[PDB]
Amino acid sequence: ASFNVPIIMDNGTGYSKLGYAGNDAPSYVFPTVIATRSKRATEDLDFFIGNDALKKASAGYSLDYPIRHGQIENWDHMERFWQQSLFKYLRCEPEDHYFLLTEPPLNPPENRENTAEIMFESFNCAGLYIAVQAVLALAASWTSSKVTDRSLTGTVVDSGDGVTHIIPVAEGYVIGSSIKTMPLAGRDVTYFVQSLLRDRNEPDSSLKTAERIKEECCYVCPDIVKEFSRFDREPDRYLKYASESITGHSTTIDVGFERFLAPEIFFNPEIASSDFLTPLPELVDNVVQSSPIDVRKGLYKNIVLSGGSTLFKNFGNRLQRDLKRIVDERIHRSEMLSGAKSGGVDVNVISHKRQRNAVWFGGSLLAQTPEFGSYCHTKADYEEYGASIARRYQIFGNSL
Amino acid sequence: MSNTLRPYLNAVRSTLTASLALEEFSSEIVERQSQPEVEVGRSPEILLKPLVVSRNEQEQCLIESSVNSVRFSIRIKQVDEIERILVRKFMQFLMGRAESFFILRRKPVQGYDISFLITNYHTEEMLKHKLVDFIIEFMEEVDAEISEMKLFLNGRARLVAETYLSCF
Amino acid sequence: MLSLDYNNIFIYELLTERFSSENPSSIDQVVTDFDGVTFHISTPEEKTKILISLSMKCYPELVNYGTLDLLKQIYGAYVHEPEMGYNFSILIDLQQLPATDEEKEQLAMSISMLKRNVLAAPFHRAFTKQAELADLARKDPENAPMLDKQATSQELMAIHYRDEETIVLWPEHDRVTVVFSTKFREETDRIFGKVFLQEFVDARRRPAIQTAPQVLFSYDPPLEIRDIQGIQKGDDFGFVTFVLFERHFTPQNREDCISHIQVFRNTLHFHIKASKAYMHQRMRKRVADFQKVLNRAKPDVELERKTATGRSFVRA
Amino acid sequence: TALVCDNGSGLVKAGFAGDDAPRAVFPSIVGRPRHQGVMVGMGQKDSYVGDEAQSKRGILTLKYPIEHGIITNWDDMEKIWHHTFYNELRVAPEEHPTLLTEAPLNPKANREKMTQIMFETFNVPAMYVAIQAVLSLYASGRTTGIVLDSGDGVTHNVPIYEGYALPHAIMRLDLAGRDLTDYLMKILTERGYSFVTTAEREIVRDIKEKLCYVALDFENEMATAASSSSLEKSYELPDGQVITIGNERFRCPETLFQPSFIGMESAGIHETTYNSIMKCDIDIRKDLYANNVMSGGTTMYPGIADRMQKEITALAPSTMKIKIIAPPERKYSVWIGGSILASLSTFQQMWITKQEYDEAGPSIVHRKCF
Amino acid sequence: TALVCDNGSGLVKAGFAGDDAPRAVFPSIVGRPRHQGVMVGMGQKDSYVGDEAQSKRGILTLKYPIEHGIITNWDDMEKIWHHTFYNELRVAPEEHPTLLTEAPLNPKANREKMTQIMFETFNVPAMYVAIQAVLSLYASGRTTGIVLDSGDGVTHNVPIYEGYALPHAIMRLDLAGRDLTDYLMKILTERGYSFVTTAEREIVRDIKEKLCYVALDFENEMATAASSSSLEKSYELPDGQVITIGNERFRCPETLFQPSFIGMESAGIHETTYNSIMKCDIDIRKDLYANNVMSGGTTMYPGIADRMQKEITALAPSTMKIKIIAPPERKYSVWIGGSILASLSTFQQMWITKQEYDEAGPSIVHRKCF
Amino acid sequence: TFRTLDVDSITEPVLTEQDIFPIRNETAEQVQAAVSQLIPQARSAIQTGNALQGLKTLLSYVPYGNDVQEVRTQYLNAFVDVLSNIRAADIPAFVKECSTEEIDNIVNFIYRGLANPQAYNSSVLLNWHEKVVEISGIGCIVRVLNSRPDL
Ligand SMILES: Nc1ncnc2c1ncn2[C@@H]1O[C@H](COP(=O)(O)OP(=O)(O)O)[C@@H](O)[C@H]1O
Ligand SMILES: Nc1ncnc2c1ncn2[C@@H]1O[C@H](COP(=O)(O)OP(=O)(O)O)[C@@H](O)[C@H]1O
Ligand SMILES: Nc1ncnc2c1ncn2[C@@H]1O[C@H](COP(=O)(O)OP(=O)(O)O)[C@@H](O)[C@H]1O
Ligand SMILES: [Mg+2]
Ligand SMILES: [Mg+2]
Ligand SMILES: [Mg+2]
């Protein structure tokens, strides 16, 4: 492999985190959005991305998010997003560098195939590793890079903008049969905040204002009928949020029960959706109880949080208490049949200083390894087998 | 386009239309299953002989045929390295859409640029004279499509040259 | 983008943040650039003090062409001892900044512009020596041919600035000539790059851009570079020549001309990549034309009425 | 399927994409009681909509929320849209995309509030706003022509050549069937009959819809009526008393050809059509003259197509064939062409979607619906 | 069989060597839509070329890639060449050697770039670039004469004696059919007709082709047209409107004899033809005067050969005969002569072959062609 | 692992082509002599300018077998050389007077010619294909699809 630093690109549904292996942060963290125009033809040169795309809606560009619900679904826009990432922001030559890419555990064979042909034929990268994204978020949880600080067994709950998935990993191996996914994350709680501002007919219900009300005003409560009652009993529970309009004037928004009812989307997904029903503490139980019996203590002892939509105030404490309730009720059913007390299991949900970008920090830490260039597809593999080299699922069991 | 291609595309049309006498046929090697027999080859009595129609050493058809399936594969004009790149990538976008063009393969057979599989079900559920019209209209136009793409590539190479060289 | 930025965008945004910031956090950031260049940005002793260091494989050649003198002239009191594994370094102290937002902005710009400033010294050496030769040729126009013939060999700069590009340049009394001994090693970029290099030279023959530097192209080397060490006439290099005349490096235009000529092969490389995205949209547009030729084989049938989620509907 | 809602100034016309005709067609009216509600219970309501307002009208003040193609009252327009979805079509609007319509040269805010109410009040999955005359050209089976569309509140001319609209040549005229109804009230007053209330304005609209017609030569018809009983005929009011009228039958529609009858300084609908053709580039004019398409209820008068052809033949050079296309279904051509458009497969990519509105706000309509 | 193209400045003439006339003759034009397509499912194309651009011109801006015999837009020229091959002749360019054609005294870059595009973009097996005036002698059956060739973009004189050209006596005049269309648009304005757009220019080109002629004595014709309406004619626009035309009917073509009408300091076509003969060696002049060949569309005006013989007889010494050979097929004589040349058995070693180009580069054309 | 071991190829032997098509009732040297008598007649008919009788005589016997590729390719060399020497105006009058078995042999051997363009001129074989299918119909290609694999 080349001696140049690998380039790390976590392309999320909400945000892309771009940087180089071994740095103390991503070089860029900006929305996974493209601004596109809607006698020589140049409208495919005229686009913008990230923070510079958000500035272009008033100039008549159509904004789009080429990743939705965790999966790339517009390969024209994702190719233009990557070329602009590589040549504007990272300012790099693909021929000199190995790349770490990411996508959700479910992601189609078709997506890794389409990713490999853009990377090896459009850009001609030296080599590509498409990582299992929340497996990197386990490695970001270490107290330091030294081997004695590693905890190679843990459940990881990743919750970004587009999807939340719970991954069991034990001794560094991903138990792919036990992956659970909930199709609801940080964007669906924004659409719920937006919908509640809109039901009150508030002066502003733009998407940025609903987003900023999540980041600043929202938190996870114990129980929504007790918390609705606390919003009768105590008057300063309602906040006032000052927002500036697209046409440049002030507004003031009263923010109310969406402060607790919007983060409740994870703990009662029947608020968000007709199609998904199991709450996150029961969904994490289903991951560990489908997983092999000898790893269950290790998977409960280390439940790592990952992705921006896990950062709600009191989120890890609600998950820990509700999962500890599920776990001890199941252990006590067995103690009451057997007539003897167990040792129990400690359920620990872990929030940590790198939790916001744990996939990128893990990708950086794993791409720093001396062995890394041997796990990549090299362009010499792609010259023989084409994009079919990337098609086989890494995380799940394959037939053949 | 068809003055130079006319003798060739008439031979392709006539023999593709002879070859599409397809039928429902279940497997003799697997029970309660049917498979496109040209694509599996496990029972040779229901394979018809493979026929090559050719204009040139570089411009060729292979027609492979069976009781319930035809596989049709083509080599297309690539007279320079720009056309070798442009053809390969155009066929990859076209075969990437194969679920919506129901008679496309997702991969060509080795040594061919694009390939088609017409099965019994396609001759039952689609107008088979319009299937062979789509094959011949694809063969008639693809050389004009690819040559126009190398005009667009020339036109962009001029755009960046004039934009660059005019800001001294 | 139709054109590349000249400066490192990360260094510009980071310094524009830290020069404004109320409370600077620490940093430890290795940052890549084009042509194998790399930067290290860090706070190695205090959060208050940022060290920016450049690594560049041709820096020893550039020092022979007066680079340290230009970097001391540009960065002044901020110049620092080189960091280990880096060729040049600058220390900026966040409590020692200029008194205005506009001086801070042009300092954040100046430090982001550092790759093109280290690489500008051979071009300033050629422009300032052309002004000496211009004055001598203005003194005696019949001695000028011999001054130009000796300056073509005695005042030539070659920079082997990456393993597949040599930039060669020299002054004569009315011009600076610069030759890019240029190559693409990736085979699809060599094929598209032949079209880009051909249409580049043919563009300069059209009436609309006669105001530009003269351009010439070949794939043996220009006569006056044939015996420069590391130029080789069979080794798949093309040779793009620019003749900058006095009007292309007039005092209002020198620094833009330097910035813009250094990025030549980088704009060509970038546009050879971006042309693939253009070809791909050209392709999938006529995949959608060929759909309509297959759609005429679908026999016409009415589908049942469905709601937006695809659930069946029972009305009309 | 998708809803098509041609919410015009005088009638709401609504239904489903791919249907032969609108299955909901009702007055674009909200009615509110103007009298002492003395009996307790009695099935009384705070307001009434459409055919319920039109049948109760003797006790209601009637008002249209839309005038000259512009929504003037959004609270009553939401009341009308609610009546379309829940009462008249009997659908969940959150299950169906909706194709809406408006006249050209409307206020920008009309399109914005119309998209906002569809996504935020009615929770629609997707919507689009079409120009009404562009819809009427699909209902003609044509891809070139000039469409003269005249409804209740607005008349407009849109020229289209080979699917390209010429937006500089588009004409609007804020004169249509409501101005003709108001003028029929003003001239009925001269023969002896006063119609004054918003309820009596519906009686004289019904007189206009079956007594009135367009004369081929107005001064000959005016002289023929001034000298004979033969143009005179009668109508019976709800009260059973009889109205007889004569030259009022063709003087009312003549206001489309002579807007000065209502004090307007504008060309008539014939000369406005010719002025739109003459604003188009010289090569397209021949095919516009051969394709004058009539639309909307104010084009339903007897003799108006024969008059329009006579008048445009005098303005155009004699060297070419003027043809006026006036289908018997032209009462609904905007809705018919909306049901064509909403059923096309490329149009399925042209919708503004819920997700795309939520990301962009109501300004998304100005950069997607033209 | 070889291909032959006169890529003229106004028309493409294309076909096969050994045929009697061009297979394809069409406008050397690319048209692009100026308006927005409002109608879904229409056959909307990114650009149109030739007769399809000319047919759709009311919605297109029209551009010619060739100006004054020089290719000014290489992208639109490549669109025209692609249209000649794949749509008009409908043959693949790799299959036949192609005879292209050029005016004398052109930029050397025009011929190199034309050569590079045929060998590397269209991948032709062999090609050649002939001078248009040399081909006009092949069509005329001559090996001695002076050709006055005048197309859409350039007028040129080439004197040839017994198969030898005299390249010092060659004359070029960047004034031909397009400059006469520009001037007819300008002098139509003074009778009150406004033609401005790129499509109205094509109507004025048709007015010039249908009605203009060369007046044998301009001041007697100006006095005649001032005295009576007998010189006036009428033309009907695509709008069905009629325009009537008088002295501007012959004052337009007089710009060939009086270039100062369009403000340019140069000799008229009679004086450039005489100056070309007077640059030749004294013994050959006597045979050049008897062998004036006229070619191209701008030589098609009624009366131009009579005017041209009158003016050359006034310049030349009266002791010897002036004869001008202006045949009725002269509109296609460059192509006809290219079909003759590419058909000669003694020409088949004169092609530039692909194998001979890619050992020399596009400068091969300057040593294989005149 | 067991999944990849081919048991079917040894436990259930499939039909061979000679179970579908009857064995050739002539030896390799017997057919090689029979063709070596015909090729000189086919060459000689070109020199007298009677290439139509050159085909009518060459077509009177056809070699087949996987043991005879050398004499099959020599017969195909003579067949394409004969078809290249018949004038294009004679083809319609000759095709209508061929038997269904002679037509079946012509359309079979133009197909063997079209499979190898570096040896054979496709332009004349496609001209013969157009005229043979125009006069005798689609069923002649259907007989080639159904034909023996060692023709
Ligand atoms: N403090 C916070 N509290 C709650 N949600 C947050 C917070 N900070 C960021 N988010 C939300 O996290 C999501 C982005 O997380 P990220 O991990 O970057 O998602 P992704 O990788 O899928 O694009 C957005 O919905 C964002 O608004
Ligand atoms: N038969 C008719 N004769 C005259 N006027 C008619 C006729 N039918 C309808 N109208 C008039 O047309 C108008 C309604 O037409 P419509 O196209 O539905 O308008 P809108 O779309 O703007 O609501 C009313 O003024 C109505 O009285
Ligand atoms: N009958 C005519 N009378 C006058 N001018 C003509 C006539 N026919 C054609 N033209 C002019 O000559 C041009 C075409 O002549 P042509 O010889 O084909 O020119 P070119 O080779 O440059 O394309 C037309 O575009 C028009 O300007
Ligand atoms: Mg994410
Ligand atoms: Mg209306
Ligand atoms: Mg010409």
Coordinates of C-alpha atoms in Angstrom, one line a residue, chain A residues 39-42, chain B residues 152 155, chain C residues 278 282, chain D residues 164, chain E residues 29-36 44-50 52-54 56-65 73-80 198:
Chain A
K39 CA -24.1 27.2 -25.6
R40 CA -22.0 24.4 -24.1
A41 CA -23.7 22.1 -21.4
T42 CA -22.2 22.7 -17.9
Chain B
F152 CA -19.9 16.0 -26.0
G155 CA -17.1 20.0 -26.5
Chain C
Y278 CA -20.8 14.3 -17.6
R282 CA -25.1 11.7 -21.1
Chain D
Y164 CA -43.4 25.4 -25.6
Chain E
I29 CA -27.7 25.3 -39.1
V30 CA -28.0 24.1 -35.5
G31 CA -31.2 25.4 -33.6
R32 CA -31.7 25.4 -29.8
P33 CA -35.0 26.1 -27.9
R34 CA -35.4 29.6 -26.6
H35 CA -38.7 28.9 -24.6
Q36 CA -39.6 26.5 -21.8
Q44 CA -38.3 17.7 -26.8
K45 CA -34.7 17.5 -28.0
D46 CA -31.6 19.4 -26.7
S47 CA -30.9 20.8 -30.2
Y48 CA -32.1 20.4 -33.8
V49 CA -30.0 20.4 -37.0
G50 CA -30.6 21.0 -40.7
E52 CA -35.5 19.9 -38.6
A53 CA -34.1 23.2 -37.2
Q54 CA -35.5 25.0 -40.2
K56 CA -39.1 24.2 -36.0
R57 CA -37.5 27.7 -36.3
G58 CA -40.3 29.7 -34.7
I59 CA -39.2 28.4 -31.2
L60 CA -35.5 28.0 -31.9
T61 CA -32.5 30.4 -31.9
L62 CA -30.6 29.4 -35.1
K63 CA -26.8 29.4 -35.4
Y64 CA -24.5 28.6 -38.3
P65 CA -21.1 27.1 -37.3
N73 CA -18.2 26.7 -33.7
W74 CA -16.6 23.2 -33.7
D75 CA -19.3 21.6 -31.5
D76 CA -22.1 22.7 -33.9
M77 CA -19.9 21.6 -36.9
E78 CA -19.5 18.2 -35.3
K79 CA -23.3 18.0 -34.8
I80 CA -23.7 18.8 -38.5
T198 CA -32.6 34.4 -36.5

